[PDB]
């Protein structure tokens, strides 16, 4: 069911009016917007729903696996089939640039999400990413969908689809490294600190590089457990790549909203942001323990910041304290 | 209208530099296609030799 | 008439009201532009090292002519294994088109034995590309200096 | 004669391995085996760069674009920072 799953996924996915000159054009407008599609492919995509996801999911499971990752893989089917990669890549990122608008419609924005994770999982192909595949500007436009997915029964099915999304990107990141790109660094920790304040986190979470992307159910666990994934020095690259991802928790380590200054508003008292600081203070005890050398210097730099920048609130102090 | 003609100069600048950055990825895939081929020869030459 | 002077000399204080800004940022940038030109000789100095390194190999190439000569003189095939290394030597002589300004890409300096090796003095080969990337992390370069 | 050729094709063979400017060595650093025959398709040339002798291609293009060293790369990043001083400005 591994060719026949990825032909079955690929009727309502390969449609009679399938437009690769549209493709072609995005790919050479730098992939920074999407032109509406067709009716004709959005209907067949539609026609069946998620349901359709789902069966490209199953359609590229024995291909992401491993056991047909071959020479009779995704790219040999595809040339003799005459598919292109390319096309489903320009589907996932019309369906982000429909997650990119406001006031959106809650099953838009799943298909969006799943459509951005099948685009994870298409990369989580070994090779397929020097079959031009990757674009930089796309991804990280369905990186910030992830902060965009947030409307401006939603919200169970928004965090779903927020949830296979994160799943398949953090199964996708000890595969891919950052070596070459230091600028999702700033990106997607932004995303991950933005996409913190979503749930409360009742229990203190112990962050290694071995949690399942089904175990931590909760988005500030999945986004430590990608940023101790990033501490790695093929992921995190210097210093440079520490200290904005320490100013970038010094906000949320300072009880306070986002933002900096005193015009920002200081936070209420809510035990879901002291049950949030734990997790950040046994999660960044955690990552002493690894480091036990360059920790030191940058987490001093880090409390330089910290003792530049106070509120004087009794709970704020205690808190700090 | 001061600040727009430096607004369109910095607009310049960051065009061309995501230009220059589209340049540095195509000649950049363009040599991995030797660094593929370079692949193939190594592969190649250690067959051919033993 | 003086009224409509006094807002001249106005003028003439708000033309420059500061200057402490733009005297600090062509600071910098003039810092920049002497960081361009020090890395430039420094990179001069890694061009004539790398010069130094085409200069060992082929003053090796020209004493091994010499030894396969005095083989081929005096049997066959050990003149042509010297050969054979010389010919891969010149392969790898490409690297004498020194591609990074090109100059001391064939300009050779007056120590030919001595100072034209690259691989018997690792400082030049070390403290230069350390002053470079030194100096490459440090430039944010700009006409900034020159256009204030 | 032809044990020193033997000696020769060796020394090619062990030279194959474990250098930088040398042929496997980087076979092992890539791990590059999506590929057991990494010609995909058709091979083109061996002209538009060499293994042998390398710095013969396009990264003559490459340096031309490298004679600006100014890091106009802030501007350049997608925080449209410039653009967004624009727009708070509008």
Redesign the interface.
Known sequence: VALRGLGSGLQPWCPLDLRLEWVDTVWELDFTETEPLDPSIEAEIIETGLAAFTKLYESLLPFATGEHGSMESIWTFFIENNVSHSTLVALFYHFVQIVHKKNVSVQYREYGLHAAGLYFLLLEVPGSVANQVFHPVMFDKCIQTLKKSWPQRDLSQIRNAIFHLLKNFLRLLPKFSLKEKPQCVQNCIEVFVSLTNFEPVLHECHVTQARALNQAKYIPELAYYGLYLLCSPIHGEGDKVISCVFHQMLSVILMLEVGEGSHRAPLAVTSQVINCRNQAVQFISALVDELKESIFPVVRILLQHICAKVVDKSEYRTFAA | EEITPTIQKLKEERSSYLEYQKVMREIEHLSRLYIAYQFLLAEDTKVRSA | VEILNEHRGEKLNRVKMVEKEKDALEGEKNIAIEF?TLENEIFRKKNHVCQYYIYELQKRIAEMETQKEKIHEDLK?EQI?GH?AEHNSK?KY??K?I?KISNPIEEISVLSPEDLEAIKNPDSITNQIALLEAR?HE????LGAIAE | ?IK?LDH?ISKHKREAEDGAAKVSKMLKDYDWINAERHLFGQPNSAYDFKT?????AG??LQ?LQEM????GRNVNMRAMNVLTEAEERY
């Open positions: 361009l095939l294994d054979i392969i490409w690297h088109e591609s490459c430039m944010k370069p700009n | 004669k020193e020769n042998n002798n390398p710095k013969e990264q003559r340096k600006k060293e100014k890091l």
